[PDB]
Amino acid sequence: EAAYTSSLLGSIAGVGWTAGLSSFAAIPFAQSIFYRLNGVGITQQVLSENQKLIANKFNQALGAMQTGFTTTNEAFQKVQDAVNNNAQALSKLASELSN
Amino acid sequence: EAAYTSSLLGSIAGVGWTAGLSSFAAIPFAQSIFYRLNGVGITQQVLSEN
Amino acid sequence: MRLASIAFNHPIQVDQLNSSYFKLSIPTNFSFGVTQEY
Amino acid sequence: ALSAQLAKDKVNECVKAQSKRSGFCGQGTHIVSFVVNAPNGLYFMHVGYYPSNHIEVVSAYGLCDAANPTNCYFITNNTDEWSYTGSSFYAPEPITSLNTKYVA
Amino acid sequence: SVRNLFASVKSSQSSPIIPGFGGDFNLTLLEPVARSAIEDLL
């Protein structure tokens, strides 16, 4: 499963281009972001190429993701609820209805 | 709930702008309707403004 | 304790201009990233 | 099974493809997304953009001249942030509209 | 679910309602004041 997802991660920069669908193009992640950024948004090339290091705000976002994986992060709570769901019926419903 | 619908009506003209979904511009409903009429249908300014 | 709290829906309200020139709201910061759904 | 169908679409809509959509992607403009497995399913890390410092600037619609070859501009003429002196390739040439001297 | 839905609905800059929207356009969608006219009808 990690093999599948790591191939996906590798494919990101190549697949994400005007190219189209699968036609991946081996491209650096940096260039991929600056194209996605000059294209989805109206930030001009001068704002991106002349001054970069927006990398720092990117990495702050990634770090906050990494630091807080606690339940209060609402999304992580749903994963716990799904696990509690199937444990509930398998671990409890069966055991209590056979005692 | 009404506050939300009123906010949506106010932002209807501005949000319908190609440059940005978040980006917003003070715009009249009339001009927005003409841009939308050109946006999917291709009746040009000559058909619309006249 | 201390009941009665009522929030508000006010956003950032740009005003329509009578003149042909039209005001628009433009940002100065990037503030990227968010935690997302499962 | 239905939500798995949603997962297949989510990866194609946000991760593998780019944004240019307003509904099946991360809050604000969508820049990139990542996936990792999770208990019983996938886990999504949509990365977005956020404005956060809106400034109200008056802007003319278009630019004409004596003649009328209009160029479709913060007000003398500025072509998400900062100002640019010359359009060069930024301005196209559509037909004229009302309230002349500008497309207005 | 309600709270989540409403948050997605807004997140936009809205011009304050002016009883005149588009020129020569007629909108029932305005507020009389509290629950616009078409909402009252349904």
TrEMBL record, chain A:
Residues 51-99 are annotated as: Heptad repeat 1. Residues 27-99 form the Coronavirus spike (S) glycoprotein S2 subunit heptad repeat 1 (HR1) region profile domain. This is Spike protein S2'. It comes from Human betacoronavirus 2c (isolate EMC/2012) (HCoV-EMC). The chain holds residues 944 to 1042 of 1353 of the full protein.
